[PDB]
């Protein structure tokens, strides 16, 4: 009855506390099968930990572990790809609940097959059925864009930028309870039982969605499901419709989108793995403080961006918010000691309330009965920055090591110089 | 946080080194506990690792049956009993200390010398 934020709560608990522990297992399968007893981190850096010479069987180990783990993801994306476009602008003409149900019921039951898999210490080549069988069912990505979508649906178009502020505020709480409580269950007595939360927290999301929450969509029509006009319903979206020159800024907003969050992804592992690089060496517990205030800009950045917008408009707003997270990567790049790299998180609290106005002007483009098609598209955007972030700045952060340490973050800064120009333009061309 | 090795020494080929980590600076009750060995001119070389309690117990297999790991949690010393030692094993044992997750630091040891001959 109430609403559809706690959805995304529930479901962002869920990736929170599966990803960690599905590439945990990964390293215990793959290392125990190589004969390798040792850690199960990558190599680790400075601070006399141990000669220098390189680890050839752990080495070997931790790529085995990065190709099993890209194999996964790679696959999740492409049954993603092709099920998310077909279930969300079905979504917008039969209802935001059944949407809404099936991803859950899929991560549900891909809990259980891992689950499945780690107390019978099964091959990993089967976590590939689990995440295959849930993209099947649209994946998390289908939970994001329905959410949104149903957000979308009831509020107006002065009211969409904080609705969506709101809806993401949640994803950010519950991206940081699972981070906090697993660096606390998972590092102590976990790496089996603490997914049993995750298998709980997909049980729940998916009870909520059937029989507690109250649909969004005032009139559901009839349409049929294996119709070719999903499909269809996002080519005739962006190449023909909206012949106002309305079609140049839907581009360009979501390529923004897509550099926008494509650095906040990869900058948040980076983040992780090197908060204990050579001149920090941060203890446990820092390394959780840490986290907690990059997963508390989320909601430091929503009551900025609600105080904001009774003086600037909409985009300078985010404007506002990009140079954040610019000077934010900036100051953490040369951030050589913990004091530096503590103001580095701190000057990122505006940092996550440009996405949010993206994806809000992104809804106001559309017309009122596409939002599930705009938000299927967005979400499939979405899905590959995740794999192009990973991928990047893993790849980036080995090489700039010895040379630079941080050039990662600087990149990542210098990336979001685009985002920051393309939305300027734009409102700048509006105006005038 | 520190931990310190001290049993390494020339012992002959077949002897019993006893190799003790007394650790401190930190809990060790919650710690997992590793061994390792930088053979002269090569690279690590795990030995052994055990979970906080003292049940998930691995080896590698060219120490199977050979090496003992062990942890006194009263004490906060991790042995390494060494039977029948060979001139192949000469190296620098050191004792790591992991929390068994990927954002948690591993916590090298200073490492003794053992020169087996």
């Known amino acids: 009855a109430p609403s559809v934020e706690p959805l995304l709560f529930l479901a962002t608990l869920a990736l929170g506390l599966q990803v960690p522990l599905a590439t945990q297992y990964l390293w215990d399968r793959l290392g125990a099968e190589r004969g390798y007893v040792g850690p199960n981190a990558s190599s680790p850096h400075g601070c006399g930990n141990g000669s220098g010479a390189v680890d050839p069987l752990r080495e070997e180990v931790e790529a085995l572990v990065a190709h099993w783990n890209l194999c996964i993801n790679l696959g999740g994306f492409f049954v993603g790809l092709f099920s998310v476009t077909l279930f969300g602008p079905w979504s917008d003409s039969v209802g935001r609940r059944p949407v809404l149900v099936l991803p859950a019921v899929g991560m549900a039951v891909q809990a259980a097959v891992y689950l499945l898999v780690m107390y019978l210490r099964l091959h990993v080549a089967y976590l590939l059925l689990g995440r295959i069988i849930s993209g099947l069912l649209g994946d998390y990505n289908l939970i994001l864009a329905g959410c949104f979508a149903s957000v979308a649906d009831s509020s107006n178009q002065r009211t969409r930028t904080f609705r969506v502020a709101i809806l993401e505020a949640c994803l950010g709480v519950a991206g940081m309870v699972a981070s906090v409580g697993g660096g606390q269950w998972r590092k102590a007595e976990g790496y089996i039982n603490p997914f049993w939360l995750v298998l709980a927290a997909s049980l729940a999301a998916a009870l909520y969605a059937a029989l507690c929450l109250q649909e969004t969509v005032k009139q559901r029509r009839a349409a049929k499901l294996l119709t070719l006009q999903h499909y269809k319903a996002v080519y005739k979206l962006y190449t023909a419709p909206e012949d106002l020159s309305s079609r140049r800024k839907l581009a360009l907003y979501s390529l923004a989108f897509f550099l926008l969050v494509t650095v906040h992804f990869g900058t948040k592992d980076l983040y992780v793995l090197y908060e204990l690089g050579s001149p920090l060496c941060w203890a446990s517990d820092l390394i959780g403080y840490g986290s907690a205030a990059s997963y508390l800009a989320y909601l430091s950045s929503l009551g900025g961006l609600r105080l904001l917008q009774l003086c600037l408009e909409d985009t300078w707003v985010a404007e506002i918010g990009l140079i954040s997270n610019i000077a934010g990567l900036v100051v953490i790049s040369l951030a050589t000691t913990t004091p530096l790299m503590f103001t580095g998180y701190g000057i990122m609290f505006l940092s996550m309330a440009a996405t949010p106005v993206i994806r809000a002007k992104l809804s106001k483009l559309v017309s009122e009965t596409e939002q599930g098609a705009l938000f299927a598209s967005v979400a499939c955007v979405e899905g590959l920055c995740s794999l192009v972030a990973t991928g990047v700045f893993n790849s980036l952060y080995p090489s700039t090591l010895h040379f630079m340490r941080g050039f990662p973050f600087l990149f990542g800064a210098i990336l979001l110089l685009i985002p920051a120009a393309i939305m300027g333009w734009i409102e700048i061309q509006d105006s005038n | 946080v520190q931990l310190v090795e001290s049993g390494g020494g020339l012992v002959q080929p077949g002897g019993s080194l006893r190799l003790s980590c007394a650790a401190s600076?930190?809990?060790?009750?919650?710690?997992?506990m590793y061994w390792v060995r930088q053979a002269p001119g090569k690279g690590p070389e795990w030995l052994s690792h055990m979970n906080p309690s003292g049940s998930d117990i691995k080896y590698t297999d060219s120490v199977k049956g050979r090496f003992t790991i062990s942890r006194d949690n009263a004490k906060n010393t991790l042995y390494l009993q060494m039977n029948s030692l060979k001139p192949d094993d000469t190296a620098v044992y050191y004792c790591?200390?992991?929390?068994?997750?990927?954002?948690?630091?591993?916590?090298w040891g200073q490492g003794t010398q053992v020169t087996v001959s």
């Open positions: 790591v200390a992991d929390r068994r997750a990927l954002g948690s630091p591993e916590y």
């Open positions: 600076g930190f809990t060790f009750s919650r710690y997992w």
